[PDB]
Enzyme design. Sequence first.
Site, short mmCIF file in Angstrom:
data_model
loop_
_atom_site.label_atom_id
_atom_site.label_comp_id
_atom_site.label_asym_id
_atom_site.label_seq_id
_atom_site.Cartn_x
_atom_site.Cartn_y
_atom_site.Cartn_z
N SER C 68 0.82 -1.21 0.00
CA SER C 68 0.00 0.00 0.00
C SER C 68 0.85 1.26 0.00
CB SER C 68 -0.94 0.02 1.21
OG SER C 68 -1.77 1.16 1.19
N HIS C 96 -0.85 5.60 -9.34
CA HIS C 96 -1.84 5.12 -8.36
C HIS C 96 -2.67 6.26 -7.77
CE1 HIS C 96 1.63 6.23 -5.84
NE2 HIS C 96 0.73 6.46 -4.89
N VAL C 97 -3.86 5.93 -7.29
CA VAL C 97 -4.72 6.93 -6.68
C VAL C 97 -5.80 6.30 -5.79
CG1 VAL C 97 -6.63 7.00 -8.31
CG2 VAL C 97 -5.86 9.13 -7.18
N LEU C 98 -6.34 7.09 -4.87
CA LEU C 98 -7.55 6.73 -4.13
C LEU C 98 -8.73 7.53 -4.70
CD1 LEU C 98 -8.98 5.68 -1.25
CD2 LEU C 98 -8.55 8.06 -0.66
N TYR C 159 -10.01 14.78 -3.46
CA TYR C 159 -9.24 14.35 -4.61
C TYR C 159 -8.57 15.55 -5.28
CZ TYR C 159 -8.56 12.55 -9.39
OH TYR C 159 -8.05 12.21 -10.62
N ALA C 161 -7.88 18.57 -4.08
CA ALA C 161 -6.83 19.13 -3.23
C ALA C 161 -5.48 18.44 -3.45
CB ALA C 161 -7.22 19.06 -1.77
N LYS C 163 -4.53 16.55 -6.02
CA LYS C 163 -4.04 16.72 -7.39
C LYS C 163 -3.48 18.13 -7.66
CE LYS C 163 -4.87 12.53 -8.97
NZ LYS C 163 -3.76 11.64 -9.44
N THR C 198 -13.38 1.80 -12.84
CA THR C 198 -13.52 2.61 -11.64
C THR C 198 -14.11 4.00 -11.89
OG1 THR C 198 -11.66 1.50 -10.57
CG2 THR C 198 -12.32 3.64 -9.71
#
EC number: 1.1.1.146
Lengths: 275, 274, 271, 275
Positions: C68, C96-98, C159, C161, C163, C198
């Site tokens: 992770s 990768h990203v959340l 998200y 913020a 980026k 996604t």
Amino acid sequence: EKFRPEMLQGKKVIVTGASKGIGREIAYHLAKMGAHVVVTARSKEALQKVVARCLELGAASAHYIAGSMEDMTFAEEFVAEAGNLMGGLDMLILNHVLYNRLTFFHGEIDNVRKSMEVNFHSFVVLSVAAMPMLMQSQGSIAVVSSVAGKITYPLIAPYSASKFALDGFFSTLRSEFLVNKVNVSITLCILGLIDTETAIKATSGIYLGPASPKEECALEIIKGTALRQDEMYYVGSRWVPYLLGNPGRKIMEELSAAEYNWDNVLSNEKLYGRW
Amino acid sequence: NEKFRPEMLQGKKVIVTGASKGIGREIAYHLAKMGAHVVVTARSKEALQKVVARCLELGAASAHYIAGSMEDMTFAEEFVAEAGNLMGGLDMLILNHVLYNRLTFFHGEIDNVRKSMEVNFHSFVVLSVAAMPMLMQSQGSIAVVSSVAGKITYPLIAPYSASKFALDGFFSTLRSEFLVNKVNVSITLCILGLIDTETAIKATSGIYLGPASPKEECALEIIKGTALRQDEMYYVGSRWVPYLLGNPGRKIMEELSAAEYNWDNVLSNEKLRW
Amino acid sequence: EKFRPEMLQGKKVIVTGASKGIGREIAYHLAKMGAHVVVTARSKEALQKVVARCLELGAASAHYIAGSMEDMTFAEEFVAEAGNLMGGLDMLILNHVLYNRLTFFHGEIDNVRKSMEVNFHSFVVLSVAAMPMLMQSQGSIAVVSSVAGKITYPLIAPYSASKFALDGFFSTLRSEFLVNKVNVSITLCILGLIDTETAIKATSGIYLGPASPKEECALEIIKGTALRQDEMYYVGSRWVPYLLGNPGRKIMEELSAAEYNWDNVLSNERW
Amino acid sequence: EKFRPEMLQGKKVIVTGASKGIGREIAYHLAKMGAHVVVTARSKEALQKVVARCLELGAASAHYIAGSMEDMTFAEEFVAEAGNLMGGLDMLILNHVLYNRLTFFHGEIDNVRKSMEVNFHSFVVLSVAAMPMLMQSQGSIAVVSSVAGKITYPLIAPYSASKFALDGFFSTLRSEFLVNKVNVSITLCILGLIDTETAIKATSGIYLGPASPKEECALEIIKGTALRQDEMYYVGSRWVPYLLGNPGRKIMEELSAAEYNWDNVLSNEKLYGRW
Ligand SMILES: NC(=O)c1ccc[n+]([C@@H]2O[C@H](COP(=O)([O-])OP(=O)(O)OC[C@H]3O[C@@H](n4cnc5c(N)ncnc54)[C@H](OP(=O)(O)O)[C@@H]3O)[C@@H](O)[C@H]2O)c1
Ligand SMILES: NC(=O)c1ccc[n+]([C@@H]2O[C@H](COP(=O)([O-])OP(=O)(O)OC[C@H]3O[C@@H](n4cnc5c(N)ncnc54)[C@H](OP(=O)(O)O)[C@@H]3O)[C@@H](O)[C@H]2O)c1
Ligand SMILES: NC(=O)c1ccc[n+]([C@@H]2O[C@H](COP(=O)([O-])OP(=O)(O)OC[C@H]3O[C@@H](n4cnc5c(N)ncnc54)[C@H](OP(=O)(O)O)[C@@H]3O)[C@@H](O)[C@H]2O)c1
Ligand SMILES: NC(=O)c1ccc[n+]([C@@H]2O[C@H](COP(=O)([O-])OP(=O)(O)OC[C@H]3O[C@@H](n4cnc5c(N)ncnc54)[C@H](OP(=O)(O)O)[C@@H]3O)[C@@H](O)[C@H]2O)c1
């Protein structure tokens, strides 16, 4: 010729796309009826929860196998492993479907290809892999489709193509099975809007029609397949099925069967092989 | 509304796929007689060359050929561009090619199902996408050539039928969208009965006793129905059968379900192409 | 000045977030070009499938390391292990990203923190860990960002913020690398809606506009980074990039460079 | 809509980072306008001096609470205690910032983390804690940022990242508040070089740019926030704001609002909840 939950006690059933939505509910019903089930989908954790719930619910046995139906090798290997787990197969419930949304078509060729792989080609691969076991048990196949597999709606061309394809293929297969007196039943399930989380999100303030409950939907799929019906309509109206069911086509198919040189066809080695 | 005239095609820029023999070849010939520009395609170079030569004698405004397989999506895409360059545009796209498989009971020929879906269906989509800019500019038309087996099912052709049903699903949905968005490219689905092409006659031989219709008239009817921008064109050897195939129920349903859409959140969100 | 797939043959590349979506496709393209790749993400099984495919596709070599990116120790240790596996590093693709199903903001501080950790802080940690190898190879970094990293959209504050933060940091770093003639390129990739499973699920029913294909998106990221571009726009319109690219800012940055006393600075002050 | 000092008489305002520099001057102006103020920073003695001056200046009331904004628990507890002290909250002025030193970035990850905590995360925590009170009073938030929060400068990567982050977050929040007709205004203040002791030391022999006076800076922040402006530029040029203000972005944001399904969104049911 009424349905009874006992028709499924001890039966060996596969449910694809069973980690959520209609598929999950199909698993639950089958468990309540004391069937053996093998559920599949991509999500391991979700499948695990479903298996645990099915066992509590009274399933004779319950296992899961996780993998993507975009992979044809997996689809094929899945059916073998599943048959081993249960020692056979009575019912194959084809339920999974690729993620999709509502949008005007703009040229998403990759979407068209992926939809056809997941919604269609895997249904065929799974059926082929399961056919020996199904023939032995004289079992059944549920092919889960959509109102959009019988008529067209803006905003879902890729999905509709793959659901139409299913009708063409499996309806032709059923006709052949009848002509050859193969006793495996093929049930095409035609669903209206069903209140799964996925369908509700995809459509909320765009398509305004009412949704039908998923629990009853899942039960109706099980019943229609158990009773070996050709088609099963669950569309939220008692009348709509007849506007979808195309009397003309049924007449034509019945009549065109007389146009075949069956004397020949049924005695022609070259038109036969096996699986 | 109105009656067809061969002049509707004089000077028009048309692509005919699967035009080295059968119906497609005859479609090319008719178009040549009408003084259209044509680009024919198929796999066989020599056969295509013969067709181009005949088209020119017949009175085509111009005629070229490009040879390649529709199983290759890169070719399908590149073919439409080259064809557009050859004619300087495109008015009509006639999608006619097909992969046939021996009338036979199905028993696990997955590769046949995949190849049929590639050739009969996916390439039709790829070609249409590639041609759409040109077609929108010319407000042109697409002929999607299908079959009675694309409306009902027949034993012994599961792979073929699946791909033809797919075409109906896809292109019928696209047409509805084009209407809602007032895109003026017409899409004509052609439903053919048994036609007396050499290939169809050999394939059904001693298996299907049903009748065959002449290919020359079939090709002309395809051209007419597309020129007149009809939604569907039935040529099935009976004046009555089309209504048993045309599914009044579906047409009603599609008309009524259009009222179930929140079009103010759909069309107003339309601020975006090919 | 034109891109050629040979620019990546034999190159040593890291792709994060490569078990699905754009990242997976980036791995596949790199394999087709005969690059060495080390893919990473949390899912072991998914990564294993990707590695197998890459090898069949023609990768020079392919390995995976699962973990992770919320764990900074892992991010740091991952870059070292990856460098060992390939014997160096030419290109670091930060992908990768959340994601968070779109929702109005209503106090989810923990979401803001976790998004900043995963989408931002780990990008920085990974870059720092990779910098020695990248300086040696005069390599490149792809920083994968979003239209929401250049302008703001309802529904994705946490998200956006993170980026925006990426733009602030990596754009500053690039300017420093230029001033110091460090030859490591930094490419900020600005993506529109891409048709990953996604992104389609998250905006389904909320946004009905056209998404762009992920396969071409992945290729464009590879090209723009290989060609050492400052920024790479793939947003589904040939015009939109200029409304996002902010001519004013580029002018200002060019002009304000003349306000610095490069004497007292460049004369003075590693990893 | 012209500003008048009376807009702040009796108002309940919080000023963070108010022991020196711009924040101190913001406190002083507010006191002259007869507002209630709660000032905060780490230094007790410095805050005490500020409170005394504010009272002497004509503040309606003035208190201080000392603590570090690196501690999120403090940030949260501070807003509650402050609201108790004044019996509510009309304006939240977010001004504090971590000390930074002009230097090329050389892998100072801890600096990046600490800057993000102090300059960004605490701004968010404070805002969340204050939102109920602000909604009740239909009050305002001043988010104090920098030219380096709109464009990039060599030698301050950690600082710039955190200021950019602020723009991303609070600009998104503002758009949401507008869509939902929440009447709390959010003002992003973009400052050029200001002649605080801290900024002058940090840039002394490096940035040869001209500094603007802190007293007028603080007043302009108060005005812009009182008038509920989206952004407030104080950069030492009447022209520069337009090169920073990015017309392209404003157009895009206005246009992309039409791409949303508000009937889904406004009625996605669960896109809401509260604080
Ligand atoms: N809901 C409706 O209103 C409606 C209407 C008409 C027809 N239908 C039909 O009903 C069936 C089920 O619909 P639903 O709404 O219940 O679906 P759903 O909730 O969206 O989920 C479908 C299932 O398919 C699985 N799946 C998705 N991609 C897969 C892949 N690549 N490989 C293997 N499994 C995959 C999903 O599991 P994972 O994501 O974990 O893989 C999930 O369990 C579909 O065939 C659909 O077309 C539904
Ligand atoms: N004949 C009928 O009774 C009947 C009935 C219903 C529908 N239809 C429809 O009518 C259309 C034409 O039928 P037909 O009987 O005229 O066909 P046909 O005589 O068998 O030949 C069709 C054409 O398609 C071309 N083709 C085949 N594979 C191709 C490939 N991979 N790439 C590019 N071109 C390829 C062939 O050229 P090459 O082999 O040289 O490549 C040929 O020119 C088809 O769409 C069919 O589905 C016909
Ligand atoms: N898709 C779009 O429309 C779009 C638009 C703008 C920007 N982008 C940018 O494109 C990039 C990729 O987007 P995508 O849609 O392809 O993403 P995706 O499909 O949702 O997956 C992204 C990858 O990140 C990985 N990941 C998630 N959490 C992680 C963690 N904590 N530690 C390590 N890895 C983690 C995931 O693997 P695991 O879950 O297995 O860990 C996955 O492989 C992102 O930076 C995104 O911001 C995409
Ligand atoms: N000055 C400029 O040229 C300039 C330019 C652009 C933007 N700005 C913005 O203007 C705002 C104020 O700048 P300034 O020059 O007035 O600042 P400053 O004089 O350096 O002091 C800022 C205040 O923040 C407080 N602070 C620092 N660390 C803290 C922590 N961990 N917890 C709580 N409080 C803390 C300090 O008090 P303690 O040390 O006692 O805690 C001080 O009162 C900042 O947001 C800055 O980014 C200034």
